[PDB]
Design a protein around this ligand. Structure first.
Ligand SMILES: CCCCCCCCCCCCC/C=C/[C@H](O)[C@H](N)CO
Ligand SMILES: CCCCCCCCCCCCC/C=C/[C@H](O)[C@H](N)CO
Lengths: 48, 96, 287, 246, 246, 287, 49
């Protein structure tokens, strides 16, 4: 979760609404196993 | 390698606004900006990451993950945020 | 050094024994306060009274082999863990799916349930035939579907391309198909008894069906079809045998006394309790 | 010399006159998790004296017809003591238990109880229904009875569909009224995983089943309570978060 | 280099851009009680990561007329966290605190807060009555306000009848909106006794008093919250018993 | 070794300084990035800017003594901690009792309250006289009554036998009586501010009079009579002075700004707040 | 902004224990990732038509 610790303060004549971009990755202890076939893509028929 | 992670989904934001999450001056203190579950293989934010797509070719995963937040606001804006990770056993916290 | 209190084995050991134990000659003893016969069963330790102490024995050098009783030769025998029925001609259908559980039925289940924890590899063998027992030169496909992989939705589905999921193509007249499987659990051992719930939250006292289930034992799905574009008209049955090899076992426990009512649950019927024994005529007459 | 004995852990102590030795389950002591076996990367907390100590539960009154009782250990202690509070605030748990059962009686009473520690003890549903959807399942409060414990319906199968005669394959001790007035067993932490949640999972159960029934003569004391004392031993916790009791 | 800084304790971490150094009160670090200074003979428990860590309390909204606030530390944390549970089950307590106060604002805001750690801070009654029996006494909830904190009536005397100008004789730090956005102070355990009860006694208070008031221009952000973060540091507990929260 | 994580100063130091600091000759500096004048008061550290850095100074070897400012010479001065009124002739009466509190009134209280913790010995001196100031050859008894000892219930009470309680017999015309007292606290230091309650339990928000009191400061009672079987007719007043010696002080704090309303409590009247300063005419005119 | 991913590790962020990791990294090599066969084409032959 991402919470406001204090507040978002801005001087006068400056935009009062901003954006945080979020990001993700792994570290050197991250591993995987048991390779399977992914479900993200489907095909209805042969691709001409 | 870090990859763009989508948090804002909803029915709105159209194409590229899904990548951004808003921060703005809050009247009531101690307010929740955003949340999401950190399972990379689960449908959700991590599908947009390239770590989340590569862990869908694999059944199991083990290791530490890192999440990076970059603030695109103006130079003259200030603030402090609290980002917290809660191990399982309950739904998301109600208050910080 | 500034504070002192912050400044701070097992019992037995395993002996390699190739053959059964021998016997050494003993003679009568008459004296006091040496009594191998009297034991205390309350201590929880079994009687250490031996042959040589109780009566007079001769010198016997025993050549009988102990090997056949190791757990690794005890599970070396293959058994039937599941049987899946495939009819390609009936209606649409076209494929068969079998979720992998070796608790499917009895003989092999009753063996594996005398240990709480087992780590091992496996070897699956697929014996396929017609309902009539006859063999015909049709090709079959056996695809393994790990947890989270999308299941086949039909005979023509793209699921069967198998760029990742391992498959076995074998004709029906050929010898059975056989493969080796590693130890795939996310934990360090399989466990046949899990006392607990897979998730947090409320647990109703009406339907508890979540109880007892261990996710670490879910290996996913095994699917089978017959490879053609047009639907063949035949009925087909696939028996699955598995050897169990490179096995390790922990914390043994008692065998099942009662008939198994359910596949995943150790339920029994309390009116029918079998009293494992055979009835007799009084006591003090043996057969 | 062997009969008499005294334990100590934390600020609690137990003394016994008539005890018969001590059972150490599977010939191993409780230990902390070694670096090789560990997986979770956080630094676990080791409270020691605040957690490890003897806790006494409410007493069971043993009557001529009594059928036996059972408990689940990382259950009974979840709502009691400082051990219970660490268990609700932490996602991960490891520890062994030192266990002590106590039943007094006169030299004119007779009977025997079977005390046994039976890992991964899974109670079962009682009924003839073979259909999985309509089949009975044994409640929540029957599975995790808590401090108050639960009683067997039919102890002969141990509610598990398994013969009680073979229960001696588990770390066990008899308390025989003519021999000893208490039973003691130390259990190292066993599980397929280095840590496991305390509130979801129950590592092992305890079973006190009156094999030979309770018998005495008129004029003797009728009320014969049974009391159990359990010491979480060599405890560890991890995965700190807000309190979840259920 | 000196501006930027990061703390860490337990599983919690704090980062600051604009911070100005760190105050270590009275030039000593928190320590465990030495063998010579100890008195009570029981073995104290040292939970470490479960207790020692940063706890964030609810935020105070600082307004142009704000008069200041205060807290009592072995109070605010008695009902929250695992630290609070050890404190209710134990009769004896010792620890130091690492303290962090946080107030953001723009380069167009101006004002100054005085953060101070004032040991044995005793609030006083407000009234002209010289008779001891009818004299006013400052409530229970004004003395130990708990997590929510209490506000001064007249900060100039600090409610203690003592001049605020001399409050700089206490470990203290300014948070000045043009200079730094946060204040940090580490406090070793101080008291006349090696251990002391957590629920009865409050070792020290914290005082955030807006010396120079808060001023800005129309169009600027009006809401300026103040947040405090406290880490019980190098904790010890003893005298285990049943929970007493009051 | 089996598990690694179980395997695991101050700042400054005190310099003995017999005399005040000297001054060393300095000259003009013109260069960049060396600025002793600019300080940051936000850091909580006081300005380290010295004389020699700010302007040009001569060589001054300072002989002024620093001794008189030590805390041990600062409390070496005796002060009046209490005064007890004894009338032996009025009604029954016959004895006077004074519970020992050195907060009784101001000057000495205001000194001792600039430190939170003080450990020290004490020396009490008893100056006794008539209401008229005159002295008369009557003998007096001063008995100290430690906490828990039974107080005198009358002039003839057996409490005055003093087989244990230390006493002082002195005639009224003689020089004052003087005794040394050790450090009697059950704690390791006296503390003039205790934030907390002496007991557990409920704490009403109406009358909190239990609040603030530190039991470790209660030294018991001091009693006085005049020794005769028949009641003398006179009025008498006993002033008690105490030197404070072998003193140690910890964690200093600010002085009292406001007049003291009560003996045991730091109460003030919030309407009368004094604004410690003197009023002035605007600013930018100094007297 | 620099285009480099975060080098923040576990040991720096919070307190960790000593963990000696035996988990194998082998199965993720590109040479085991493509070792699996897949269907690249299907051709229909009718000799009688
Ligand atoms: C081409 C098909 C190959 C199939 C490979 C699958 C092997 C599965 C691993 C061995 C079996 C694991 C033990 C089974 C657990 C239990 O039967 C249930 N999951 C629990 O009721
Ligand atoms: C013959 C009479 C000798 C009397 C000896 C008594 C000496 C008492 C010890 C020194 C005084 C202790 C400090 C006093 C504490 C404070 O005044 C109050 N107890 C707290 O309000």
């Amino acid at each position: 979760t991402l919470w406001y610790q204090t507040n978002y303060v801005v001087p006068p004549e400056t935009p009062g609404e901003a954006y945080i971009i979020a990001m993700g990755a792994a570290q050197d202890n991250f591993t995987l196993k048991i390779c399977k076939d992914t479900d993200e893509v489907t095909q209805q028929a042969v691709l001409q | 390698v870090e990859t763009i992670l989508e948090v804002n989904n909803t029915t709105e934001a159209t194409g590229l606004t899904r990548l951004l999450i808003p921060v703005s001056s809050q009247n009531k203190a101690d307010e929740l900006c955003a949340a999401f579950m950190v399972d990379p293989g689960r449908i959700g934010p991590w599908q947009s990451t390239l770590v989340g797509q590569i862990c869908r070719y694999y059944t199991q995963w083990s290791g530490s993950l890192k999440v990076t937040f970059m603030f695109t606001g103006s130079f003259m804006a200030t603030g402090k945020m609290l980002v917290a990770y809660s191990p399982p056993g309950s739904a998301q916290p109600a208050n910080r | 050094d500034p504070v002192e209190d912050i400044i701070h084995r097992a019992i037995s050991g395993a002996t390699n024994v190739e053959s059964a134990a021998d016997t050494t000659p003993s003679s009568h003893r008459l004296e006091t306060g040496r009594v191998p016969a009297l034991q205390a069963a309350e201590t929880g330790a079994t009687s250490n009274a031996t042959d040589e102490n109780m009566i007079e024995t001769r010198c016997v050098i025993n050549r009988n082999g102990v090997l056949e009783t190791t757990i690794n030769h005890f599970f070396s025998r293959s058994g039937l863990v599941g049987v899946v029925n495939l009819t390609d001609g009936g209606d649409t259908t076209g494929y068969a799916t079998w979720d992998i559980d070796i608790m499917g039925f009895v003989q092999l289940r009753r063996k594996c349930e005398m240990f709480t924890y087992m780590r091992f590899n496996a070897e699956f063998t697929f014996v396929t035939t017609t309902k009539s027992g006859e063999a015909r030169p049709y090709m079959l496909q056996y695809m393994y579907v790990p947890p989270g992989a999308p299941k086949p939705t039909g005979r023509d589905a793209f699921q069967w391309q198998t760029a990742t999921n391992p498959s076995v193509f074998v004709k029906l007249t050929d010898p059975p198909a056989q493969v080796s499987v590693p130890f795939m659990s996310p934990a360090s051992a399989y466990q046949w008894f899990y006392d607990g719930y897979p998730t947090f939250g409320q647990h109703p006292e009406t339907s508890n069906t979540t109880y007892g289930l261990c996710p670490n034992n879910m290996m996913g799905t095994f699917a089978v079809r017959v490879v053609s574009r047009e639907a063949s008209q035949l009925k087909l049955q696939t028996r699955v045998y598995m050897k169990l090899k490179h096995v390790r076992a922990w914390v043994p426990r008692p065998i099942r006394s009662q008939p198994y009512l359910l596949k995943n649950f150790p339920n029994y019927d309390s009116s029918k309790i079998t009293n494992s024994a055979r009835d007799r005529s009084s006591i003090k007459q043996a057969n | 010399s062997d009969r008499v004995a005294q334990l100590t852990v934390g600020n609690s102590s137990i003394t016994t006159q008539e005890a018969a030795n001590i059972v150490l389950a599977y010939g191993e002591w409780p230990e902390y998790c070694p670096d090789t076996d560990a997986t979770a990367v956080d630094k676990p907390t080791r409270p020691d004296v605040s957690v490890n100590r003897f806790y006494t539960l409410d007493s069971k009154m043993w009557q001529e017809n009594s059928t036996g009782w059972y408990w689940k250990f990382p259950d009974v202690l979840n709502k009691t003591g400082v051990f219970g509070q660490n268990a609700q605030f932490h996602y991960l748990y490891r520890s062994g238990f030192c266990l002590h059962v106590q039943c007094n009686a006169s030299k004119f009473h007779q009977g025997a109880l079977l005390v046994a520690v039976i890992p991964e003890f899974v109670i079962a549903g009682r009924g003839s229904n073979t259909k999985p959807n309509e089949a009975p399942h044994p409640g929540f409060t029957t599975t995790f009875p808590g401090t108050t414990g639960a009683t067997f319906h039919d102890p002969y199968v141990l509610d598990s569909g398994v013969p009680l005669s073979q229960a001696l394959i588990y770390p066990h001790q008899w308390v025989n009224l003519r021999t000893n007035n208490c039973a003691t067993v130390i259990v190292p932490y066993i599980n397929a995983v280095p840590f496991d949640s305390a509130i979801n999972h129950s590592n092992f159960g305890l079973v006190v089943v009156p094999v030979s029934p309770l018998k005495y003569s008129s004029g003797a004391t009728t009320a014969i309570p049974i009391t159990i004392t359990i010491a979480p031993l060599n405890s560890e916790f991890g995965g700190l978060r807000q309190a979840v009791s259920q």
